[PDB]
């Protein structure tokens, strides 16, 4: 693993730590959220970014970093602003870019 592949997986870790329920730990499906793929364009989960990390798909810090807002950004589009999925994505956002600095 690169010095790179170290960092993300370290952030990694401490981003998934915050989400302790895993609602961001694998892609959202259509089944349980009716109509998803056809309203977020581009889809994002910890799981597609464990791979991405592994797969050497980061080439720098910043990418990773727009792959988790989008992942937040995602959930604050399709879930209405009272729910618990709006407000762990608005949560981990802005604590999750703070832990990274
Ligand atoms: C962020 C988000 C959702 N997250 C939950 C989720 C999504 C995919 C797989 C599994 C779960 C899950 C469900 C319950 C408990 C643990 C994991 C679900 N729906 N939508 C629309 C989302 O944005």
Do not use: W
Not at 26 to 55: E, L, N, Q, R, W
Request: hydrophobic share 40%.
């Amino acid at each position: 693993s690169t010095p790179i592949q170290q960092l993300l997986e370290h952030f990694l870790r401490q981003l998934q730590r915050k989400d302790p329920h895993g609602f961001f730990a694998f892609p959202v499906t259509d089944a349980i959220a009716p109509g998803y793929s056809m309203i977020i364009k581009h889809p994002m989960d910890f799981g597609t970014m464990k791979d991405k990390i592994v797969a050497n798909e980061y080439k720098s810090v910043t990418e990773f970093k727009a792959d988790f807002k989008l992942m937040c950004d995602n959930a604050m589009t399709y879930n209405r602003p009272d729910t618990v999925y709006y407000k762990l994505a608005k949560k981990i956002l802005h604590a999750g870019f703070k832990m990274m600095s």
